[PDB]
Design a binder for this molecule. Sequence first.
Ligand SMILES: O=C(NCCOP(=O)(O)O)c1ccc(OC(F)(F)F)cc1
Ligand SMILES: O=C(NCCOP(=O)(O)O)c1ccc(OC(F)(F)F)cc1
Ligand SMILES: O=C(NCCOP(=O)(O)O)c1ccc(OC(F)(F)F)cc1
Ligand SMILES: O=C(NCCOP(=O)(O)O)c1ccc(OC(F)(F)F)cc1
Ligand SMILES: O=C(NCCOP(=O)(O)O)c1ccc(OC(F)(F)F)cc1
Ligand SMILES: O=C(NCCOP(=O)(O)O)c1ccc(OC(F)(F)F)cc1
Ligand SMILES: *Cc1c(COP(=O)(O)O)cnc(C)c1O
Ligand SMILES: *Cc1c(COP(=O)(O)O)cnc(C)c1O
Ligand code: NA
Ligand code: NA
Lengths: 396, 396, 268, 268
Amino acid sequence: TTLLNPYFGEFGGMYVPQILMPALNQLEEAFVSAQKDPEFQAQFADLLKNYAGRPTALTKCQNITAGTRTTLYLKREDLLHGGAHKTNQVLGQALLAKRMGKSEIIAETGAGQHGVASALASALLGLKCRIYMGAKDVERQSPNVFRMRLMGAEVIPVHSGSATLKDACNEALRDWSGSYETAHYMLGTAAGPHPYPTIVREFQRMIGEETKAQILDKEGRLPDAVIACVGGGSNAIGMFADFINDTSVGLIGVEPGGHGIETGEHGAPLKHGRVGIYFGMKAPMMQTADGQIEESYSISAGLDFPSVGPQHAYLNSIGRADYVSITDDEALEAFKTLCRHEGIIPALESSHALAHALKMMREQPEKEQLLVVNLSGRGDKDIFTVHDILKARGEI
Amino acid sequence: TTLLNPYFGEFGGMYVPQILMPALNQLEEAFVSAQKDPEFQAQFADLLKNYAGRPTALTKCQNITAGTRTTLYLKREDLLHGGAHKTNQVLGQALLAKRMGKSEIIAETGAGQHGVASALASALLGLKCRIYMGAKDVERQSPNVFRMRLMGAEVIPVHSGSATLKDACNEALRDWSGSYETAHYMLGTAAGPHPYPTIVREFQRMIGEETKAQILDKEGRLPDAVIACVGGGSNAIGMFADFINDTSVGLIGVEPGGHGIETGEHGAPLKHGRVGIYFGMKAPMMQTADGQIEESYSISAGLDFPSVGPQHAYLNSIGRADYVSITDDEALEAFKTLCRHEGIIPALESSHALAHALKMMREQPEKEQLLVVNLSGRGDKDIFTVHDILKARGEI
Amino acid sequence: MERYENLFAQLNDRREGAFVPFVTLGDPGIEQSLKIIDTLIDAGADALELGVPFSDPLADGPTIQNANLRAFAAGVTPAQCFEMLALIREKHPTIPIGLLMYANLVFNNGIDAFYARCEQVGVDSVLVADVPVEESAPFRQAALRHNIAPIFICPPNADDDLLRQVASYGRGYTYLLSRSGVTGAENRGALPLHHLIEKLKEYHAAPALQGFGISSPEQVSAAVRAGAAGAISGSAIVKIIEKNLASPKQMLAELRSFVSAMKAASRA
Amino acid sequence: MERYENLFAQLNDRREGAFVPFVTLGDPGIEQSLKIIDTLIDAGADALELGVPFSDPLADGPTIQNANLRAFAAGVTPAQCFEMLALIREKHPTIPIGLLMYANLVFNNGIDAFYARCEQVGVDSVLVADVPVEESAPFRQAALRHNIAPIFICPPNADDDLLRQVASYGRGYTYLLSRSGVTGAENRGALPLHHLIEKLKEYHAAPALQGFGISSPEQVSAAVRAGAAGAISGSAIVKIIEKNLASPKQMLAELRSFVSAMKAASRA
Ligand SMILES: O=C(NCCOP(=O)(O)O)c1ccc(OC(F)(F)F)cc1
Ligand SMILES: O=C(NCCOP(=O)(O)O)c1ccc(OC(F)(F)F)cc1
Ligand SMILES: O=C(NCCOP(=O)(O)O)c1ccc(OC(F)(F)F)cc1
Ligand SMILES: O=C(NCCOP(=O)(O)O)c1ccc(OC(F)(F)F)cc1
Ligand SMILES: O=C(NCCOP(=O)(O)O)c1ccc(OC(F)(F)F)cc1
Ligand SMILES: O=C(NCCOP(=O)(O)O)c1ccc(OC(F)(F)F)cc1
Ligand SMILES: *Cc1c(COP(=O)(O)O)cnc(C)c1O
Ligand SMILES: *Cc1c(COP(=O)(O)O)cnc(C)c1O
Ligand code: NA
Ligand code: NA
């Protein structure tokens, strides 16, 4: 029995071993309670304002859109403390941990970004943080590993399975199943078993709430569309949620197309995978014909969660949101464009959202449209990746 | 003849070849005019808000100060777009360039930070940017060079003299002497010939203005002291200016002590150099006994300007501000402390200011004091430097 | 069929517990795994629990994770596991055979079709590791429509609502977890096993098999003395496979000795 | 002393321009530099302009920057330059000697003491590259107190206020810049040189020497024809040093030929 619906239509649920159900029920009750508690809301608002830097700017991009009828704004989550939107929800989940009497945090990370986010929130709130990371990711992500350790987190290299994101998720859950009396599992996107897709949306929804207020103030109307990249679904649902009932507002989610959908080397399960049950949920995922879970491929490691949040699968199924893909080369060109024309270095994740808006603009340059891209993060972390690719094809 | 006083007591002036005086006079008039122009102020405010992310947060640090009578706040310039305070004044100087009918920017950079700042402002405002950088700095600063190039700036490696910051300053000035009809020289700190120390202060003063408002709102009184690192003097004078007339408020500037003042391997000319005339100004500088200009040494390359802004020399001489130094090891410990106890990775520059506040606190833990540290930048850029040092002494 | 019901009746008449090994199908290869399974039976196993190799075996510990990897190294697929199941049933008509599945492998080509394939090859039960009772309806319905018993984990800290659900919904046997945590501190919520055994009987649950951490004969006798119908052992059996990869003949000899000792512990 | 005044009077009586080489003291070493300077004089130089090596020669182009580096490589210090100056004056009693200084080297051990040392060694003038007329008061005062002429740059775009200041404040000669920029576009603000020459005479300025980019005999005659009292050449002379580092004897021969040709161009 749950307090809230665990499903978004047919998608979602709580597909975890029986031993974990009391951990999810406890978390759901704490969340339901927190959301009614003005003191919890005030504490969360205080961290978001005075620690993280909320509200974030909404930047117009007249240099990019010159000569067209597109007006383009970027929601500047790249300016949040930590350099990505992940910070919003780790702060809320750290407060939920404290609410439940927990002094320890467990988190998973792929290439380190959510590990750093979890580590910074845990440092601020005085929680003992342990982060599972696939040994292959540890080797390749020295800067993130070092950040985590500087912040007092324990980084635990995962040698099991294929030593990557999936195995890290698996070890985090195994640990939590035994330690949940004292430890909270700080899941890194709007996916996994209920209540996580709901919690992470509600702890990201200030993105779209601020966007709505800022666009109303600057333009006197709602956007024609808001556009966000989709790895797991958290920045996108954060931007989308407050606009779901504004039926005129397009909601466009951009999955990574990798080397191109037709190569099979992509990370677009919502539109090009097949519904399965894994990660505690029923959702589209990357999987073999006989149902072994596979990996997503993207130039952007942050977009490599091989499934997608169940609310995105639902919003797609009813036609409320539309999902598209952007390839590695498309994202690279958008990265270069923003650097050169606005002096903002975007995360390669966010560059997928921007690339799709550029396409909306360029394909139809006389279409009147007011677009917001969720600029989910900064791209300093990506300059070596970008350098190497451009050098390798003699583009530089 | 000038519109404003070029000196702060005996310090400052305009010690440039005669051919550059019309460039400085033009710039001074444009500035004086801009400061009276509500349209210029509104444009600058708009860039600071909607592009750079102003106002920046003021973060309390209860984890650091627990058990003492210090209350410590950090002014979060690390959250400004670009990750340091330099962004404020490059935006204002880019607007001054446009005001004077200039379409090109020239800038100097040491290890690349001001070069990136100049490049981002120029990209946003559609100006053609060329940046002089010592060839030794280009070799060692691939990430900054790459950022500059991504932003459409021309990076010009300087092989003359000793191929470092001084030679870069020299080449920028040489270029400007010939090109000033069409190019503006975007000097990178509150130093050099008048009017630059005045301009850069006024285009950084929102740091202390916001600090004053935020501390009044949170604490109901002014700070006992504001503390800022001093490389050239811009972040410090930005924090100090609005408090100069509040004579109860301590103004503490922290120069880099390097390996220790007594080694001679430091960057503390204001307290341990000797007044000279170079960089267009009379000011303390690092120099041999027979008056050849030397280098500053710090673990933090950003603090290596071998002189200091003339307003700091003046405020020191009258006893209004006090200047101290912090060694490499002191700054390293402050870096580690902030990472672990607040989940903020500070620039090694800013870590010198924080280290001094930690000393104020620890030496006298029962002294009631309300302190603000200007956290001038983020320290992601420093993680390799920090890693290598800690590894080298087996600390990690 | 009625293989569990007939087994427990026969064992009851003999005042005897069941001993039920777990292995991963196709570990360390298909041929050797078939041999392993025949050896477990010839040494006295009363029933089998068999895992289908899965890319992400969340609910399994290091020993069984290692077994899973070995089976993938051998290229073992679920279709090959079903071929193996049919051969095993064709050799051994009465032994209850239970599968340990992950939900994606059941759902993949349709839940009903999965259970119909289980029925065709002569499987008796399926425990879906990542389907809690709360989410189990379509699984248990499909299972029972195809004469397959759905098996549920009963944690030792289970509340009364959970006890009643497990008692109502499960068939064949109730899987009684030995421990809700590994550390004495993590296992604080765990109630006495004899009390849960008694509650399950009161609620007319399928007979209880105790599993997780059963590695020695004394734990087999302890389970029976606490009132359980028997005990399941996986890691201890699979360890023998892992320790003897280089010697397939020694592996089978050691499996035989281990299972014979564990079974001996269940007899009146 | 009155060495510039006596020189210009003598040259006027001969209807002759001055030719004034610039070199860096101690480039490429002290010994060779003394020899260079004697060769410049023996070839016809009317006056000298001499630079003291400085860590940051902002106002100098690549050729003179290279000369500066060579002198530092040789370990040349300002104290050694002053020793050289005294020896040069002791060989050549009437030739005007002017220094090209940077403000830090003048200010370093006291402005007055600097000019007193200039007087002791028999220097005639000092041009401080980075002191504009606006900031010049303590420099010109100290210079004149010690019988040293302060020299100022007059840019070719100079406004009338600047012309009047340069005319009032300078002594010995007025340094008339050939160009306010290198490109024809950058040099658009530059007024005709003959007009500036005429304005300087109207304001009773020290006689004008034209400098910057003078590298050929025709530019020496052009300067004189425009009404200037002479011409200064640095880069062209120093290039000869740089091109002949490996052959000190050839270097002196080429210096002699070059200076003789440039001086010939100034004679009636
Ligand atoms: O996508 C996920 N994590 C994102 C980590 O972010 P990063 O460090 O950027 O890879 C993620 C993690 C766990 C999960 O569900 C479950 F817990 F059941 F496994 C679902 C998604
Ligand atoms: O300190 C200066 N630049 C800072 C550059 O910053 P970074 O890139 O961080 O080294 C600096 C640059 C020029 C200057 O005066 C003058 F133009 F006359 F040379 C005085 C100070
Ligand atoms: O069953 C467990 N381990 C021991 C028995 O399995 P195995 O070692 O494979 O025989 C086991 C451990 C953790 C668990 O919870 C969750 F997966 F959610 F993390 C569920 C089952
Ligand atoms: O039977 C199992 N393992 C063998 C017995 O445990 P051990 O002897 O400790 O390997 C077994 C049963 C269920 C399971 O998953 C979950 F608990 F989630 F349902 C995992 C392992
Ligand atoms: O004099 C100049 N160059 C040519 C003559 O010098 P040199 O080449 O050393 O003889 C010269 C070039 C630029 C300049 O302005 C400033 F330094 F401010 F940038 C001042 C003088
Ligand atoms: O006399 C000088 N150079 C030699 C003549 O120029 P060139 O022949 O082009 O080297 C000379 C004069 C002044 C100067 O600095 C400043 F202009 F700022 F005062 C730099 C060089
Ligand atoms: C983690 C990350 C993402 C992808 O995660 P979502 O949960 O899909 O939002 C996208 N952008 C940036 C900058 C990130 O750090
Ligand atoms: C450039 C820089 C400084 C030093 O320059 P100041 O002009 O002395 O402020 C200090 N902190 C950071 C983060 C910087 O980027
Ligand atoms: Na995905
Ligand atoms: Na300095």
